[PDB]
């Protein structure tokens, strides 16, 4: 049967005070399997299920550094969207990203996902073709023009058709 992997990432700026709280949660077949929380005593990705303890320290170190980079990305882009929506600084805002893959019995990519939401509203989403973008409003059209010119869709497609499927199968084997 089919299988799926998804990551949901959120960053929340509270009252503009300090660093956004960043969280990332991964799911395989609708089961949470890893998780990162910036508010933890020492922020690292942690296994949420016993079959993930099969991965060595290098795996954890690596994906933790990916989380570290993502924190910065979310910081910068929260600021950018404050700009696009002409909102005053000092407020509370959330930026979310969901991405991942569905694969068939065949073990091949059935559908990829890469999509972003701001303050609980759709912002920009990669279409099923993994080539074109749905922009939810006029602000998101700015990003879409930039992303069409930068080949962002190809960038995400490289992960969705490569790493995403491979890792999903590795985790299905681990489980």
């Amino acid at each position: 049967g089919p299988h799926s992997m998804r990551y949901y990432e959120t960053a929340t700026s509270r009252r503009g005070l300090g660093e956004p709280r960043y969280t990332s949660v991964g799911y395989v077949d609708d089961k949470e399997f890893v998780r990162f929380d910036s508010d933890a005593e020492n922020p690292r990705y942690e296994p949420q299920v016993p079959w993930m303890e099969q991965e060595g320290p290098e795996y954890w170190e690596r994906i933790t550094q990916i989380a570290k980079g993502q924190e910065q990305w979310f910081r910068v882009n929260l600021r950018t969207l404050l700009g696009y929506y002409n909102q005053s600084a000092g407020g509370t805002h959330t930026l979310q990203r969901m991405y991942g893959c569905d694969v068939g019995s065949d073990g091949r990519l059935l559908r990829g996902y890469e999509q972003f939401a701001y303050d609980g509203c759709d912002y920009i989403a990669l279409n099923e073709d993994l080539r074109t973008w749905t922009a939810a409003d006029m602000a998101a059209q700015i990003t879409r023009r930039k992303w069409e010119q930068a080949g962002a869709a190809e960038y995400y497609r490289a992960y969705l058709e490569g790493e995403c499927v491979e890792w999903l199968h590795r985790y299905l084997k681990n489980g």
């Binding site: 990551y7 990332s24 990916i66 882009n77 950018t80 990203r97 930039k146 960038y155 790493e163």
Partner: peptide
Amino acid sequence: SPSYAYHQF
């Protein structure tokens, strides 16, 4: 394994 968003809004 998670991925980078990379591209700026």
